[PDB]
Design a protein around this ligand. Structure first.
Ligand SMILES: NC(=O)c1cc(F)cc2[nH]c(-c3cc4c(s3)CNCC4)nc12
Length: 343
């Protein structure tokens, strides 16, 4: 049996849960006979990304439907689906490419999880064995600490279709992140920010850290180009947990992010290089946390102030977001297990 505290053991169970992996592939309508969970290829996913990028290129120009259909067909030939009574949906627009790209993102992290879970060598509990494979130190933050109270206040005030309840707070330290982050600790404007993702991605996120979309992947849906995205509103990030009322539990990260000088934008702009002297993008929202209630936690700004009007004139965004284009600018500090109370 395992030496780990019960919440840590349950975290390990939920992120390595194989039923959840197969359930995800079934909901994507993947043919599990043609492409089993155990036979996912990073190389196969890579090629699929490029097909999707070519599809998006064709769509953007305006191309022969015969060309769009041959590309769309090439994708489903590479990634095998079983749509039952229906015909495969034609990949001929932006929303459709994005959905399939976001599905590839998820499949890659599932492959990382299943690879971790299958690999390795008797005396130890499988919970402990699989814990160590995350290369991440995970401690339970006590409910009656200033840390947990600051964090719980952050969840209450920046929650603006569900109520949010914090079940467990874990303090986390990924191997190598301390060293990788240390130069960026010199930048001013360090902020504690939210980052949400599906539960089936968290074995990948913890072993590899938050990553940037590969260049093969379509840029569709990335308002500010390929980067790592964060919110100062727990609601905005919690939507990326994709939590179903079937299983109303999600996982969400708090990261220390070294923003430096922010390139502040009101509208979509696919970034490929920041201006000199800029180290992050800030998307400006209609609503921002009240800056008078900014508090500090271990030298990092926590923007937990309740939502007020920002006064930004012509904004496309309801809330702020923050993007960095270097993976070393992120120091993952906490992992929250959240209960979504839908109402
Ligand atoms: N995860 C977050 O917490 C988050 C927070 C934000 F404030 C804005 C975000 N945007 C995204 C995107 C993820 C993906 C996109 S946008 C486009 N297609 C591939 C996958 N995540 C956030």
């Amino acid at each position: 049996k395992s030496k780990l505290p019960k919440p840590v053991q349950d975290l390990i169970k939920m992120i390595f849960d194989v039923e959840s992996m197969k359930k995800a592939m079934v909901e994507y309508e993947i043919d599990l006979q043609k492409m089993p969970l155990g036979k996912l290829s990073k190389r196969q996913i890579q090629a699929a990304y490029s097909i999707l990028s070519e599809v998006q290129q064709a769509v953007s120009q305006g191309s022969s439907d015969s060309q769009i259909l041959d590309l769309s067909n090439r994708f489903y030939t590479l990634i095998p689906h079983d749509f039952g009574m229906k015909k495969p949906p034609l990949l001929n627009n932006a929303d459709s490419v994005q959905a399939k790209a976001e599905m590839l993102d998820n499949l890659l992290d599932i492959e990382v999880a299943y690879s971790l879970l299958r690999g390795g060598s008797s005396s130890k509990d499988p919970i402990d064995v699989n814990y160590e494979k995350l290369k991440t130190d995970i401690k339970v933050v006590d409910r009656d600490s200033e840390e947990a109270e600051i964090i719980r206040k952050y969840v209450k005030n920046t929650h603006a279709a569900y109520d949010l309840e914090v079940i467990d707070i874990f303090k986390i330290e990924r191997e190598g992140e301390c060293q990788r982050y240390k130069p960026f600790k010199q930048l001013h404007n360090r902020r504690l920010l939210w980052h949400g993702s599906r539960t089936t991605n968290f074995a990948g996120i913890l072993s590899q850290g938050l990553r940037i979309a590969p260049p093969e992947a379509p840029v569709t849906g990335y308002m500010f180009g390929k980067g790592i995205y964060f919110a100062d509103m727990v609601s905005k990030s919690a939507n990326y947990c994709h939590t179903s009322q079937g299983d109303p539990i999600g996982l969400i990260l708090l990261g220390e992010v070294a923003l430096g000088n922010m390139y502040e934008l009101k509208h979509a702009s696919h970034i490929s290089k920041l201006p000199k002297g800029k180290h992050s993008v800030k998307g400006l929202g209609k609503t921002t946390p009240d800056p008078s209630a900014n508090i500090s936690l271990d030298g990092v700004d926590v923007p937990l102030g309740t939502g007020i009007s920002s006064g930004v004139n012509d904004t496309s965004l309801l809330y702020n977001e923050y993007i960095v284009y270097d993976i070393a600018q992120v120091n993952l500090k906490y992992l929250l297990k959240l209960k979504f109370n839908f109402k």
